[PDB]
Amino acid sequence: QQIGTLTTETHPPLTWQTCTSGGSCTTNNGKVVLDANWRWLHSTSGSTNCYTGNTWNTTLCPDDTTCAQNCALDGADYEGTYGITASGNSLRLNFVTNGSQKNVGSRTYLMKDDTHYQTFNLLNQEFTFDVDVSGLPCGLNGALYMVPMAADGGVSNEPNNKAGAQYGVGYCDSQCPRDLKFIAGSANVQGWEPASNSANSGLGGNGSCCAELDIWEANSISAALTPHSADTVTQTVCNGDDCGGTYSNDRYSGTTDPDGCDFNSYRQGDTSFYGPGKTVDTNSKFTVVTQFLTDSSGNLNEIKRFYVQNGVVIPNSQSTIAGISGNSITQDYCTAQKQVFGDTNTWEDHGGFQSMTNAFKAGMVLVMSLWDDYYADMLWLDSVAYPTDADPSTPGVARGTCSTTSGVPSDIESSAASAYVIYSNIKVGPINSTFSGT
Numbered sequence: 002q003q004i005g006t007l008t009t010e011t012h013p014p015l016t017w018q019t020c021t022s023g024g025s026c027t028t029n030n031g032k033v034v035l036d037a038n039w040r041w042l043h044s045t046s047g048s049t050n051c052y053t054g055n056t057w058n059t060t061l062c063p064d065d066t067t068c069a070q071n072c073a074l075d076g077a078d079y080e081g082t083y084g085i086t087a088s089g090n091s092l093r094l095n096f097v098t099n100g101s102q103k104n105v106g107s108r109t110y111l112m113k114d115d116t117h118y119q120t121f122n123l124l125n126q127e128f129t130f131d132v133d134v135s136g137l138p139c140g141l142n143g144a145l146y147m148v149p150m151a152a153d154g155g156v157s158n159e160p161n162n163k164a165g166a167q168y169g170v171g172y173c174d175s176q177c178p179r180d181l182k183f184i185a186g187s188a189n190v191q192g193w194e195p196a197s198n199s200a201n202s203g204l205g206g207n208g209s210c211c212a213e214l215d216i217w218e219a220n221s222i223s224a225a226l227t228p229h230s231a232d233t234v235t236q237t238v239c240n241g242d243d244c245g246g247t248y249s250n251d252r253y254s255g256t257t258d259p260d261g262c263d264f265n266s267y268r269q270g271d272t273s274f275y276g277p278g279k280t281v282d283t284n285s286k287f288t289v290v291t292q293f294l295t296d297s298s299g300n301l302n303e304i305k306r307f308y309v310q311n312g313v314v315i316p317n318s319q320s321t322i323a324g325i326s327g328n329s330i331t332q333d334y335c336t337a338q339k340q341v342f343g344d345t346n347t348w349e350d351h352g353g354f355q356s357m358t359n360a361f362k363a364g365m366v367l368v369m370s371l372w373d374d375y376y377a378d379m380l381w382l383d384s385v386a387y388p389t390d391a392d393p394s395t396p397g398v399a400r401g402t403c404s405t406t407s408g409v410p411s412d413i414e415s416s417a418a419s420a421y422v423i424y425s426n427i428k429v430g431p432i433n434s435t436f437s438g439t
């Protein structure tokens with residue numbers, strides 16, 4: 002994709018901290034950038050759209066290469082169009098913005114400078130942030146996560162990609178998404194079909210695969226921490242159903258792990274721990290600490306989670322499911338959880354902890370998003386039962402308190418139009434350097 006010249010692109014400033022063993026902390030001047038899919042995409046020779054709603058202009062985009070030559074991503078009005086506001090160390094994302102037209106959700110990335118994403122290697126470190134999920138009801142997901150996107154957005158070896166990280170180009174994840182307009186320096190017009198339900202989306206012939214660390218997927222009801230492995234941790238292109246992932250007819254047939262090794266306190270049997278008025282009280286802001294412990298070789302062997310609220314350090318809840326113990330993500334936990342729940346261990350199949358180690362060594366980009374779910378209504382995160390016809394007595398079926406009929410986008414895009422998430426006070430450093438409390 003090309004650089005559009007009709008609207009200035011100014012990345013909202015966002016500060017975040019680096020801490021050392023001490024724990025003294027200093028402030029980094031980061032910037033955030035909107036993902037390329039949300040942008041106006043128009044001809045390089047004027048204002049004619051290359052894509053509108055769910056449909057490509059086939060004169061501008063007769064094939065994937067020509068489309069990339071002809072089409073430019075332009076600047077974004079972060080607050081006015083997308084409901085994205087950055088102030089100091091806080092980033093607020095609104096679910097619905099009624100601008101000149103309606104916008105639903107957003108996905109953003111943390112930038113080092115105007116043309117490069119910040120990258121992270123969290124091995125033997127922790128990543129910490131504050132979040133307010135009080136405005137997120139059933140069906141919403143404020144996701145803060147990491148994927149090994151190219152720091153430059155792919156421009157170095159993609160001649161038809163001039164827009165790069167400056168315009169939020171280069172996304173990939175463990176679902177191998179085919180709804181992306183640009184993948185690896187080419188458009189995705191070939192094979193495009195508009196979505197059956199969403200007016201804003203569709204699926205092209207190709208998907209964008211990579212490893213994925215879901216540090217945080219949550220609303221006010223439930224939260225999940227989920228690493229996902231991949232054969233190749235950085236971006237690869239896939240085609241059609243062979244992609245695997247959410248919008249494939251053969252979910253597990255691809256080169257990535259679309260399920261991950263998840264820890265949701267509620268799904269792991271503790272329904273008193275996370276939610277409204279619970280131990281981690283989602284009515285108010287809290288701190289989320291995620292630690293990435295290594296073995297003697299420097300390979301990831303454990304992900305620990307702590308919360309801090311009202312000045313109290315709260316260890317992650319113990320899994321209470323018979324056969325699945327502990328309160329952290331380890332190989333023992335992942336093996337046990339998949340065996341006991343009767344889920345395919347695609348996490349292990351695509352390299353598990355070694356894959357995530359390799360993802361960190363490649364360099365992870367921080368993603369902050371807010372979305373609803375046109376595939377499964379977020380029921381996998383927050384439903385009394387997922388699948389909806391499964392027995393709630395069966396371990397692993399219950400994930401939250403939301404009804405099986407909750408979270409339908411056409412419903413919640415009206416009823417939850419006030420929804421929002423605020424991520425703030427990001428801190429990164431050695432283990433135990435980013436937080437304190439009793």
Ligand SMILES: OC[C@H]1O[C@@H](S[C@H]2[C@H](O)[C@@H](O)[C@H](S[C@H]3[C@H](O)[C@@H](O)[C@H](S[C@H]4[C@H](O)[C@@H](O)[C@H](O)O[C@@H]4CO)O[C@@H]3CO)O[C@@H]2CO)[C@H](O)[C@@H](O)[C@@H]1O
Nearest residue numbers: 038039052053054102103104105107108144201202370372
């Ligand atoms: O065309 C003008 C029209 O544009 C919309 S903006 C619109 C984009 O055009 C469209 O490409 C994307 S598709 C988007 C999808 O809606 C969203 O549900 C998923 S959420 C995704 C999440 O971000 C990730 O964090 C998570 O890991 O996976 C989730 C599921 O994939 O992302 C898709 C893109 O990758 O949708 C936007 C918004 O509808 C303007 O809003 C509108 O006003 C204008 O008329």
Ligand SMILES: *[C@@H]1O[C@H](CO)[C@@H](O[C@@H]2O[C@H](CO)[C@@H](O)[C@H](O)[C@H]2NC(C)=O)[C@H](O)[C@H]1NC(C)=O
Nearest residue numbers: 065187189191192193205206207238239240241
């Ligand atoms: C991206 O997906 C498109 C659409 O499926 C692929 O397009 C096919 O490409 C082959 C080889 O060039 C052609 O023979 C077919 O005619 C194309 N099919 C269609 C429907 O257009 C394309 O190959 C994919 N790109 C990559 C890099 O995998």
Ligand SMILES: OC[C@H]1O[C@@H](S[C@H]2[C@H](O)[C@@H](O)[C@H](O)O[C@@H]2CO)[C@H](O)[C@@H](O)[C@@H]1O
Nearest residue numbers: 227247259260261263344377381387388
């Ligand atoms: O595909 C949507 C959603 O999937 C989860 S994995 C999910 C499986 O889909 C389900 O079969 C099993 O019973 O539960 C697991 C865990 O919830 C994945 O973690 C997530 O990334 C994705 O959005």
Ligand SMILES: *[C@@H]1O[C@H](CO)[C@@H](O)[C@H](O)[C@H]1NC(C)=O
Nearest residue numbers: 044049050057058059060061
């Ligand atoms: C597609 O783009 C061409 C070239 O700019 C333009 O002439 C035409 O009106 C557009 N067609 C549609 C259907 O948008």
Ligand SMILES: *[C@@H]1O[C@H](CO)[C@@H](O)[C@H](O)[C@H]1NC(C)=O
Nearest residue numbers: 292307314316431432433434
């Ligand atoms: C960090 O603190 C946690 C919780 O208090 C403790 O379990 C752990 O031993 C500490 N780790 C280090 C490296 O100090």
